């Protein structure tokens, strides 16, 4: 469980780079994935700026 | 607080993405037989008869 | 997708279109017959052994091309347009994607 | 743990398109993660070529 553990953390950091590329794709749908509510995004250029 | 400089890559270091690697099958399990069992324990006590 | 044998499917020499100079695909082309004595049929690579039936992958020529692209089992070189030779899927260094979890 | 095993194989065979599709956006940060360090990369077809 603690490789379990290992492996999760380090799939997490890994599929970062990933989620980099999705925000950059669709920011909306991933800026409300990530906030947990149904929220409209921006360009990011560095960070994501949302709205309700 | 780390900065780094990409230079234009070259055809010099091509790299490749590992293929799918065969995921490993599922244990047979192990074939059980049912069935009624009557396990017996040696006789430690004495046999008892009516004597006169 | 319609399955086609690895023996059907040839490699074009170069990627240069002769009617429009300074004009190359960025892909290369492939010939290759439906079966063993079906004619050959003209087309374009795609991706992951994929046959594309129209050759509209074009760009403009551009110096240094030293490209790669994948055959069957293996990779197929080329340099400025030009066909080299085939490559071994062990011939390139191999980075795992993969998280392993022993 | 075995089909937690199973689940993990087909679960990078299955995210290695998402990788894929990754490398064809943002080479140098997918190139970068994939290795270990960071390096600029420039995906020459079907295969990357990188530099550190």
């Known amino acids: 469980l603690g490789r379990v553990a290992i492996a999760w953390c380090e799939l997490q950091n890994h599929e970062l780079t990933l989620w980099n590329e999705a925000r950059k794709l669709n920011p909306n749908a991933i800026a409300s994935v990530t906030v947990g509510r149904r929220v409209s995004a921006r360009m990011l250029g560095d960070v994501m700026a949302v709205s309700t | ?52 | 997708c319609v399955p086609v044998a690895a023996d059907n499917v040839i490699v074009q020499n170069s990627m240069r279109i002769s009617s429009r100079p300074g004009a190359c695909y960025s892909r290369p082309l492939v010939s290759f017959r439906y079966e063993d004595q079906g004619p050959l049929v003209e087309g374009q690579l795609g991706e992951n052994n994929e046959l594309r039936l129209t050759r509209d992958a074009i760009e403009p020529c551009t110096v240094g091309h030293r490209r790669y692209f994948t055959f069957g089992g293996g990779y197929v070189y080329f340099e400025e347009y030009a066909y080299s030779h085939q490559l071994s899927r062990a011939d390139i260094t191999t980075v795992s994607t993969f998280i392993d979890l022993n």
Do not use: D, H, L, M
């Open chain 2, 1 to 52: 607080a780390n900065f780094y400089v990409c230079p234009p890559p070259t055809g010099a270091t091509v790299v490749q993405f590992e293929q799918p690697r065969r995921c490993p099958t599922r244990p047979e399990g192990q074939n059980y037989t049912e069935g009624i069992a009557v396990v017996f324990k040696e006789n430690i006590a004495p046999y008892k008869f009516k004597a006169t």
